[PDB]
Design a protein around this ligand. Structure first.
Ligand SMILES: O=C(CN1CCC(CN2Cc3ccccc3C2=O)CC1)c1ccc(F)cc1
Ligand SMILES: O=C(CN1CCC(CN2Cc3ccccc3C2=O)CC1)c1ccc(F)cc1
Ligand SMILES: CCCCCCCC/C=C\CCCCCCCC(=O)OC[C@H](O)CO
Ligand SMILES: CCCCCCCC/C=C\CCCCCCCC(=O)OC[C@H](O)CO
Ligand SMILES: CCCCCCCC/C=C\CCCCCCCC(=O)OC[C@H](O)CO
Ligand SMILES: CCCCCCCC/C=C\CCCCCCCC(=O)OC[C@H](O)CO
Lengths: 165, 163
């Protein structure tokens, strides 16, 4: 495996590269002041909220805000370092850091995916109206979060086993 | 003593993983397992803790908190006896990557728990901490499950006896 191994490294590199605009421009809007973001980016996030009926990014809970702070202080600095190593290739120094990132991101998203799939968004619940009401809406919203669990899982199994790391 | 700091932490982690088995099985998993699997005295004992210290998570377990409790059943509890043996015996390089995975996972589960106790509002959703002293007591009973895994992560990242 030398062509499929490098192709996975290119895929991981773009995942950590494209995560920098996504985290900065769309995700950190839930913790950073709204005055740091232009009006266009703020209205773009409201489009997503009403299109996908996301209950977490609008009125973010304290447990979700803790993960967004973890994304700013820990995950965001690692994205540029991770993209370089996987683009370059052969960087054995990224194995243990990538295992730390993979388990961390997977752990944050288990409660996130379990909330969207099972938690109740009825009028009695604290969400009070917002959120997915049908099952097709729950899959529609889960599909936005599920990449950030599968790709870190691929990275985890790729780091623990591959003798090149 | 003549154990040293390095051996003393190996023993310390062993008793941490050892005592984690009864604590998880008899107290934690009451939030995800049926009531009948537990004697009424264990359920009333946990109820005393919930009423006294105003635990909001154990009272009515939220969906996010229940997902971590299931991770404790499926992932952490099977790992507890394996890690206790590796650190009691000593010199087990095979525990490095597994214990790192446990450390990051447990630390990550505890971050939203501690942040909710400290900063969230429990006024207008069941009982919860009101005073800073009440939040401080609740942080004291959850904080060891963040510090000890953090010490473990730092212990496995750069100990040459495990690489
Ligand atoms: O919260 C995350 C990751 N988010 C990544 C962005 C996504 C929100 N989207 C998707 C989208 C598409 C088109 C236009 C606009 C948008 C838009 O706004 C919602 C999950 C997270 C990732 C890792 C982690 F550890 C914790 C949280
Ligand atoms: O949830 C935990 C750890 N809990 C350990 C048990 C504690 C709940 N208590 C404390 C107590 C004292 C006296 C009588 C009864 C009780 C009683 O019932 C509350 C945190 C956790 C640990 C690691 C992890 F990864 C996820 C969760
Ligand atoms: C209403 C909610 C009030 C604010 C809740 C903030 C939680 C994250 C705080 C950061 C803790 C994680 C540090 C890493
Ligand atoms: C166009 C407007 C764009 C808005 C971007 C918001 C600024 C984010 C900087 C915070 C990053 C801090 C990284 C420190 C890592 C610790
Ligand atoms: C629990 C929060 C931590 C998870 C966030 C992932 C951070 C990604 C990089 C970690 C490198 C840690 C130090 C690596 C030591 C070897 C160099
Ligand atoms: C009313 C709302 C009820 C919420 C029920 C949540 C169950 C979490 C179980 C799924 C957690 C999956 C653990 C993954 C291991």
């Amino acid at each position: 495996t030398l062509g499929a191994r490098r192709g996975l490294e290119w895929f991981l590199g773009f995942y950590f590269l494209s995560h920098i605009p996504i985290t900065l421009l769309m995700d950190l809007q839930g913790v950073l002041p709204r005055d740091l973001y232009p009006v266009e980016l703020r209205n773009l996030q409201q489009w997503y909220i009403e299109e996908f009926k996301d209950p977490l990014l609008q009125t973010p809970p304290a447990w979700f805000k803790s993960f967004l702070f973890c994304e700013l202080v820990f995950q965001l600095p690692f994205f540029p370092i991770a993209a370089y190593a996987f683009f370059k290739g052969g960087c054995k120094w990224i194995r243990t850091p990538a295992i730390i990132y993979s388990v961390h991101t997977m752990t944050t998203l288990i409660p996130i995916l379990s909330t969207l799939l099972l938690d109740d968004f009825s009028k009695a619940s604290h969400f009070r109206g917002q959120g997915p009401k049908t099952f097709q809406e729950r899959l529609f919203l889960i599909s936005v979060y599920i990449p950030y669990f599968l790709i870190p899982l691929i990275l985890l199994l790729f780091m623990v086993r591959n003798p090149y790391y």
